[PDB]
Design a protein around this nucleic acid. Structure first.
Ligand SMILES: [Mg+2]
Ligand SMILES: [Zn+2]
Lengths: 168, 48, 104, 49, 49, 96, 225, 338
RNA sequence: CCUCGA
DNA sequence: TATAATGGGAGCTGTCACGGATGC
DNA sequence: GCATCCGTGAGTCGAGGG
């Protein structure tokens, strides 16, 4: 089939995980003696692909007769090494993070959608202020807390854990 | 010289700080075997 | 006024020139009003009135009591292509850009 | 000027060493690491514009 | 014919160059006054006029 | 570079020259068979040493690099056909 | 600022618990809560103290923003901005149009706004950020590996800090460092001081730098070769 | 704006602990851990699961995650079931639940009150391969360890005991994260000892030392060769974008010449195999592994053609012999042997 | 980067 | 694993024209 | 409506030197 169009679109976490052949769990590149790639690291052949044509990492399968077979001992597919140019990996985040293109490209698409100013979006994203999702009927300065309110740190402490003081 | 203000102890020594490159007779240098020249720079003079 | 490559770039980018001419938004007749310390030019239609306040040392292209088209230059200098487009329309701006580039 | 910069680094290391380590037994040699000054001279002569 | 263990990595004259050899320098590891960067056994410099 | 036995740069402006002449095949050749279409360049060298005409070019490898770098930017870049159904320029080697 | 409730018998709430007015505190349901707050059970003074505090959900960072983005119902917002487009003020029509353009872009594209936040960061194939032995047997490698290693160290330290129940301040600091790591990976220098390798003032080369500029992928290897 | 200024402000919010407040919090932590052990004794539950439930309720529903060591997934349902099993015990058996809750809260406030000490220690380890904030966070990990291990009865301050763990954590992080090619802790220590030795030698010699001088100064077991191999292993990579990588060719992908040469080699081997019988050409192709990628044994090729292994070996011999004859005659396959 | 050439 | 130790440190800036948010 | 701060652009191909 002949290429006619080229489409570009946002990628969903599911789409990204679908590209991925494995998660990169360690910040390891290659071993200081063997110079071979480390397990679960950035160059691991278990994820990205074989370094040699049709040869697994440990060497149990070294020929093209095995194609698509994943060696059980070392976990490396037997296939062309060119795939180390193509196969993606991924990193699974303990907490989500904002794609800075959609933050700092003014006017911010994320900030435009949520009617948040640049300053406010910065303050929430880089942890200078809280944004309220549910007030649970909180009250600050007599005004009830409304959703999407910008709370400083003192305000959030005074509302969430109460007010107090200690005197010498 | 090292001087403890309280102890008054004074220990002095000639410490070796490494090498400084020397200029040759003609005003050039030899850095890693290659002759090099330090070019004077023009700039705005300090002042008011 | 600008010559050469700066003028060409100024035109191809549709920039508002630094020293720009002042043009008439509509037709009308020219009534000049010059105090010794201040200057203004009025384009008076049959039913409408337009007042252009400009610095005193600007050179007029315009005699008192002349009939000026919409988008016609009153002061000397380059024309803002966007003012010309709003006043006189597309064909006029196409003409202006092509001729002004060709001058250089 | 590059000598002055390398010396500033050597002195920052000198104070960092004066806070750590035995307070009773310190020489000029134990205090001074020449490497940052060396580095400053080396970069000025090898990679300066 | 057995495939030999080693292969030819010799230094050859690049295209468009050449001349008369006028000097050869040879530095070797384990030789007086000679210490090289870690791992290199020897360095050879040929001068071509 | 001459020391690396290098090739000459056919930059944006040389491309403009070829486009202005309308020499589509000369230009496509510059962009594929002579630079970074791997299958294309291997097949071309073999064709010429065999006395055969040069084969039709295919996707330049640096376009695949671009696609993978956009995926690294979390952007999905899809080559589509006229029925808007995807086409695989990686020949299945990047899909599970 | 609190409310004391003495107890004579077994108490039904422990320390830290959050409670609303009219909840069972102690003595099998006799002494209850007046005020909204959080419970300190003083066994020395034998009193259930309730410090006035609410159950507010107020979050920080990309997690909070992602929630607010998941919540957005696009078509409703489109209707709101359309009602805004009929306003006499020209600037309000301007802002409503600017917003409605984004809303309708997401609508017609079938993209979900929340995808502008990342959960799974992608990782480039290794051959595009090589680790190669140069001529003399030494090693040379792309900057993307150092950026990815920064990311992975901070991510893993965050996972462990969470598993070990770290205080708030520490998790906040780690999450901020994580956001800046993803920042420097995707477009270094865009926000804050650019990340540099040790002993050099040279900004690391991120993916955005790879793409754009005269030296970027398009102009250097795609529109000319 | 500037993240370390922000963190220093957030740290300056929590005030410093007086001797009494410190001792009280440490005591509450100790007694709360003891109370968790007692709750394990009574409940028959797992002490770690009990600790995680008490911790979960103390911090909030904001953070409940799966703990690696726990046999059960930690989610609000299981923590609610376990907290209700912990609320269903007699008053004197319900006492330890309150003790544990207070212990958790005291532990939190103790860490937060001592977070400035980590900064004051980590500021000394900059320039070693890790960012200021990375050193700070690794020191915070160490501080957490020190809180969990501290014993207030020894009457020592907490700063004293915590400093040991904070230094330990910062140094472990340096040794584990600084190099793009990772090196084990002991190997890093050997390398740094090597460096200090070489620097002292240059400080006394007025010049950089040779391999032999370093080896002598390193003691027994160290020769010049070992110094060299050690420095070779400690060599760190350099940036491709120094660009510096545009001078680096690709040795992996076969060149067009190599591709065409293997193509003509396969074509000429088939040209030469065609001058044999189909059985002897097939025997050669099986014995060389061309047909399926691997080389068969003589018994496999013989059972494939239905013949004795000696017979298939003789067929291979005569096929090779006819090949040698044709090749000596036409000299076509000579150039490909390099 | 620099210097140099067109 | 225990004396006590509790908020960083680098910082030269000789362009200009564009869109766009930010304020008065 | 009109000043102001931020971001992004500013020729090609060579060669060498690194
Ligand atoms: Mg020895
Ligand atoms: Zn294997």
């Amino acid at each position: 089939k002949e290429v006619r169009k080229v489409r570009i679109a946002l990628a969903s976490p599911e789409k990204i995980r679908s590209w991925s052949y494995g998660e990169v769990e360690k910040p390891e590149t290659i071993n200081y003696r063997t110079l071979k790639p480390e397990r679960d690291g950035l160059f691991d052949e278990r994820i990205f692909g074989p370094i040699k044509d049709y040869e697994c990492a440990c060497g149990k399968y070294k020929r093209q007769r095995f194609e698509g077979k994943v060696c059980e001992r070392c976990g490396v597919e037997v296939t062309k090494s060119i795939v180390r140019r193509y196969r993606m990996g991924h990193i699974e985040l303990a907490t989500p993070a904002a794609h800075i293109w959609f933050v700092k490209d003014v006017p911010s698409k994320i900030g435009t959608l949520l009617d948040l100013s640049a300053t406010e979006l910065e303050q929430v994203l880089y942890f200078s202020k809280y944004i309220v999702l549910d007030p649970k009927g909180a009250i600050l300065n007599g005004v009830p807390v409304e959703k999407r309110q910008l709370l400083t740190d003192e305000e959030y402490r005074e509302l969430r854990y109460g007010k107090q003081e200690t005197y010498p | 010289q090292l001087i403890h203000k309280d102890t008054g102890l004074i220990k002095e020594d000639e410490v070796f700080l490494g090498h400084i490159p020397l200029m040759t007779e003609d005003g050039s240098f030899i850095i890693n075997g290659a002759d090099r020249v330090i070019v004077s720079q023009i700039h705005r003079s300090p002042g008011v | 006024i600008t010559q050469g490559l700066p003028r060409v770039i100024e035109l191809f980018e549709a920039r508002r020139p630094k020293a720009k001419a002042v043009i008439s938004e509509i037709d009308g007749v020219v009534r000049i009003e010059e105090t010794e310390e201040k200057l203004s030019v009025f384009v008076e239609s049959e039913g409408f009135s337009k007042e252009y306040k400009l610095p005193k040392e600007a050179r007029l292209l315009v005699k008192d009591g002349d009939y000026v088209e919409a988008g016609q230059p009153l002061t000397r200098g380059a024309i803002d292509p966007h003012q010309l487009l709003e006043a006189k329309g597309p064909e006029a701006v196409e003409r202006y850009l092509v001729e002004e580039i060709q001058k250089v | 000027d590059q000598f002055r910069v390398g010396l500033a680094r050597l002195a920052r290391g000198v104070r960092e060493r004066m806070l750590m380590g035995s307070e009773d037994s310190l020489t000029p040699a134990k205090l001074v690491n020449s490497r940052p000054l060396e580095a400053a001279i080396r970069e000025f002569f090898s990679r300066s514009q | 014919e057995k495939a030999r263990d080693v292969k030819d990595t010799s230094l050859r004259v690049p295209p468009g160059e050449g001349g008369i050899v006028v000097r050869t320098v040879r530095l070797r590891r384990g030789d007086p006054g000679v210490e090289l960067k870690p791992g290199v056994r020897e360095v050879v410099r040929v001068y071509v006029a | 570079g001459k020391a690396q036995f290098g090739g000459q740069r056919f930059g944006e402006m040389e491309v403009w020259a070829l486009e202005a002449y309308g020499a589509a095949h000369t230009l496509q050749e510059m962009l594929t068979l002579k630079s970074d279409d791997i299958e294309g360049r291997n097949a071309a060298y073999e064709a010429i040493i065999k006395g055969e005409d040069v084969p039709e070019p295919s996707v330049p490898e640096s376009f695949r690099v671009l696609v993978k770098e956009l995926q690294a930017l979390a952007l999905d870049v899809q080559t589509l056909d006229e029925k808007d159904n995807p086409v695989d320029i990686f020949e299945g080697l990047a899909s599970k | 600022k609190a409310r004391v409730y003495p107890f004579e018998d077994d108490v039904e709430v422990s320390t830290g618990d959050r409670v609303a007015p009219g909840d069972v505190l102690a003595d099998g349901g006799k002494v209850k809560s007046d005020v909204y707050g959080r419970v300190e059970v003083d066994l020395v003074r034998n009193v259930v103290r309730v410090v006035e505090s609410y159950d507010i959900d107020a979050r920080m960072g990309a997690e909070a923003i992602q929630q607010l983005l998941k919540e957005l119902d696009l078509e409703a917002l489109e209707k709101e901005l359309l009602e805004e487009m009929k306003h006499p003020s020209r600037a309000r029509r301007a802002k409503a149009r600017k917003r409605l353009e984004v809303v309708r872009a997401f609508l017609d594209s079938g993209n979900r706004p929340e995808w502008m936040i990342l959960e799974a960061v992608p990782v480039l194939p290794p051959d595009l950020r090589p680790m190669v032995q140069v001529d003399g047997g030494r090693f040379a490698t792309s900057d993307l590996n150092d950026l990815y290693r920064r990311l992975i160290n901070r991510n893993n330290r965050l996972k462990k800090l969470l598993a070990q129940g770290a205080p708030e301040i520490i998790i906040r600091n780690e999450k901020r460092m994580l956001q800046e790591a993803v920042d420097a990976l995707l477009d270094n220098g865009r926000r804050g001081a650019p990340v540099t390798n040790p002993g050099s003032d040279r900004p690391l080369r991120s993916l955005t730098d790879i793409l754009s500029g005269k030296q970027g992928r398009f102009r250097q290897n795609l529109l000319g070769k | 704006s500037d993240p370390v200024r922000q963190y220093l402000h957030e740290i300056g919010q929590v005030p410093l602990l007086t001797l009494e407040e410190e001792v009280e919090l440490a005591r509450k932590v100790e007694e709360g851990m003891e109370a968790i052990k007692k709750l394990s004794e009574i409940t028959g539950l797992d002490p770690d699961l009990i600790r995680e439930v008490v911790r979960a309720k103390i911090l909030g529903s904001a953070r409940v995650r799966h703990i690696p060591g726990l046999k059960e997934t930690l989610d609000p349902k299981t923590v609610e079931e376990i907290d209700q099993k912990l609320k269903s015990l007699p008053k004197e058996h319900k006492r330890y639940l309150h003790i544990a809750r207070e212990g958790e809260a005291a532990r939190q406030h103790l860490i937060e009150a001592n977070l400035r000490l980590v900064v004051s220690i980590a500021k000394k380890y900059t320039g070693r391969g890790l960012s200021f904030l990375d050193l700070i966070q690794e020191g915070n990990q160490g501080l957490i360890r020190a809180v969990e291990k501290f014993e207030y009865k020894r009457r020592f301050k907490f700063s004293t005991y915590a400093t040991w763990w904070i230094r330990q954590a910062i140094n472990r992080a340096i040794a584990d994260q600084a190099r793009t090619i990772r090196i084990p802790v002991h190997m890093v220590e050997t390398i740094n000892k090597l460096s200090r030795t070489a620097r002292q030698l240059q400080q006394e010699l007025g010049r950089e030392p040779t391999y032999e001088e370093i080896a002598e100064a390193m003691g027994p077991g160290w020769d010049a060769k070992r110094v060299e191999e050690t420095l070779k292993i400690a060599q760190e990579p350099v940036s491709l974008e120094t660009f510096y990588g545009d001078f680096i060719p690709d040795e992996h992908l076969p060149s067009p010449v190599d591709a065409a040469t293997q193509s003509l080699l396969s074509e000429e081997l088939e040209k030469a195999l065609s001058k044999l019988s189909e059985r002897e050409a097939m025997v050669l192709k099986l014995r060389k592994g061309l047909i399926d990628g691997r080389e068969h044994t003589l018994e496999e090729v013989g059972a494939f053609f239905g013949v004795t292994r000696e017979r298939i070996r003789q067929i291979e011999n005569k096929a090779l012999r006819k090949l040698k004859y044709h090749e000596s005659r036409t000299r076509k396959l000579r150039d490909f042997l390099d």
